[PDB]
Amino acid sequence: AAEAVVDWHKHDSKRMLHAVYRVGDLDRTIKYYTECFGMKLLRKRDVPDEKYTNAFLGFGPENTNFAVELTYNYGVDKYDIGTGFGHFAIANDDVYKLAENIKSKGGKITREPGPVKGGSTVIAFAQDPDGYMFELIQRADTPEPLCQVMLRVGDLERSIKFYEKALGMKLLRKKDVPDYKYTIAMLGYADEDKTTVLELTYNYGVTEYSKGNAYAQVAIGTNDVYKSAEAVDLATKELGGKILRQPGPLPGINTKIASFVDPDGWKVELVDNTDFLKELH
Ligand SMILES: [Co+2]
C-alpha cells in the first residue's frame, strides 16, 4: 500500500497555500508589505478568545495565489528567527526600481540590485521589520510573484525524498555550487517560474539549524487530509519527521487539517482545499 501513496499524489490536486509566521506589530508589517513590496491585504481575522490576529497578504486572491499568513499575538513584540529560516522571495519585472522604491518608503535593502555572483539574474534582498529576509528576483513573466519559501536543511537528498514521498512535490531544479559550498533544490507542484517553490538549502558539512520561534509553518491544500496524512505517516517511518496534529476537523471553524514536522523539524499543515475555500467566505 506504498504504491497507493504514489497513486494518491497523482490524483490529488495539492497547492502551496500560505507561509505562517509571527510578527511583533501587525500594522507595521501590513504597511511594509503593501507600500514597500506592493502586496495586497487579502483577509484579516481577529480571534480575541485566543489573543491573536491574522492578516493574509499576497499578490492575488487566496483561491489562486500563495499568501503570507501573519500572526500577531496580543502584547508580544518580538520573536527569534533562528538560523534555519532562509527567506521569502518576490519576483518582479524590474528589481532596480523595486529596490529603489523600498528604500524611498523607508524599507531596508541589505543587498543592492544586480546580477548574482557569476551569473546574470538580477536579485536584491530586503529585510522586513521583524528581520525576515525577502529575496527580490527579476523575472519578466510571473503568474505568482510570491515565489519561494527558502529553508535550510541537514541532508538535501533525504529532504527531497521526504517532500516527494510525503507531499508529492516534484524536484524541479537542483543546483550544486561547490565553489560557494552549497547545494539548492527547488520543490513544488508546477513549473518553477509559474509557482511558489520550496527552496531547500544545504551548506556543506552543516547538519543542524535552530527553528527559532518566528516562522511557524507552511500550509498545503489537499483534496483529502486523511489520505495525505497517511502518505506523510508512511514517509516519516522511512525518512524521519512526525505527525503532530492527526487529521480531522478544527472545532468551531470546522476546517479539516493535519500537521507534521519534516526530518529537520520544519512544520507543515495539510488543509482540505474545499474547507479552505469556504474560510474565504
Ligand atoms: Co531564494
Side-chain angles (χ1 to χ4, degrees):
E3 286 74 76
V5 168
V6 158
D7 291 318
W8 167 237
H9 292 316
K10 306 304 297 310
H11 301 308
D12 191 11
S13 198
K14 281 193 190 59
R15 190 175 57 100
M16 294 281 274
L17 300 175
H18 48 246
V20 186
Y21 51 98
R22 302 161 182 122
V23 297
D25 183 325
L26 197 64
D27 290 342
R28 199 191 287 184
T29 301
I30 294 164
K31 182 165 102 78
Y32 202 98
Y33 292 1
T34 60
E35 306 298 313
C36 297
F37 291 157
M39 293 193 201
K40 303 171 176 285
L41 181 51
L42 305 168
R43 175 163 60 114
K44 174 173 35 80
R45 181 174 52 213
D46 187 38
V47 187
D49 292 1
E50 303 285 334
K51 290 189 168 64
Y52 76 88
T53 309
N54 286 321
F56 298 80
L57 299 98
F59 296 89
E62 295 180 72
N63 63 358
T64 56
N65 283 63
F66 183 77
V68 298
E69 176 178 329
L70 303 188
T71 304
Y72 166 72
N73 289 291
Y74 288 15
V76 175
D77 274 352
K78 177 96 213 317
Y79 298 88
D80 280 8
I81 285 157
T83 56
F85 174 76
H87 53 258
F88 300 110
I90 291 165
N92 188 278
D93 61 10
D94 185 349
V95 165
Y96 286 86
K97 184 169 180 201
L98 180 63
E100 281 159 6
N101 173 72
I102 284 151
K103 288 201 218 158
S104 189
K105 308 298 184 47
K108 177 66 201 137
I109 295 302
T110 54
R111 200 264 191 203
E112 291 295 332
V116 280
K117 293 172 162 175
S120 77
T121 299
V122 169
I123 70 162
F125 276 88
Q127 180 167 237
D128 93 350
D130 286 280
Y132 304 96
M133 295 308 297
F134 280 80
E135 189 183 8
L136 313 179
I137 301 168
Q138 191 167 282
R139 200 178 274 184
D141 203 55
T142 189
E144 174 55 88
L146 194 57
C147 70
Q148 314 176 343
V149 174
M150 191 277 270
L151 300 175
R152 300 187 179 89
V153 296
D155 173 341
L156 192 58
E157 286 69 28
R158 188 181 55 174
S159 282
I160 293 170
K161 220 143 66 216
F162 180 86
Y163 285 92
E164 285 182 323
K165 300 193 106 198
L167 284 173
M169 293 192 183
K170 185 155 128 61
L171 174 72
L172 303 166
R173 196 152 63 78
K174 190 192 190 153
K175 185 182 76 170
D176 189 27
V177 186
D179 268 43
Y180 283 79
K181 294 157 193 190
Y182 76 85
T183 314
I184 53 105
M186 302 304 203
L187 285 145
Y189 297 116
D191 294 333
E192 171 183 1
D193 55 26
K194 303 178 84 65
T195 203
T196 304
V197 302
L198 191 48
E199 175 178 17
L200 298 185
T201 305
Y202 170 72
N203 288 101
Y204 288 7
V206 190
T207 61
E208 281 263 79
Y209 296 95
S210 61
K211 299 307 165 291
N213 66 3
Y215 175 81
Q217 61 187 24
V218 70
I220 288 161
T222 170
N223 290 332
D224 189 333
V225 302
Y226 306 96
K227 292 188 192 180
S228 292
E230 259 154 48
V232 173
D233 189 69
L234 219 99
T236 54
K237 280 160 171 51
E238 185 198 326
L239 297 158
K242 206 35 143 59
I243 298 255
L244 300 183
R245 187 207 262 263
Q246 294 294 332
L250 282 162
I253 67 144
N254 303 307
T255 305
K256 288 177 297 299
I257 68 157
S259 76
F260 60 101
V261 288
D262 79 0
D264 296 88
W266 291 123
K267 191 179 181 170
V268 177
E269 176 181 280
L270 285 161
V271 189
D272 183 273
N273 278 319
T274 299
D275 289 349
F276 176 68
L277 296 183
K278 280 194 295 161
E279 296 193 5
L280 310 178
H281 303 278

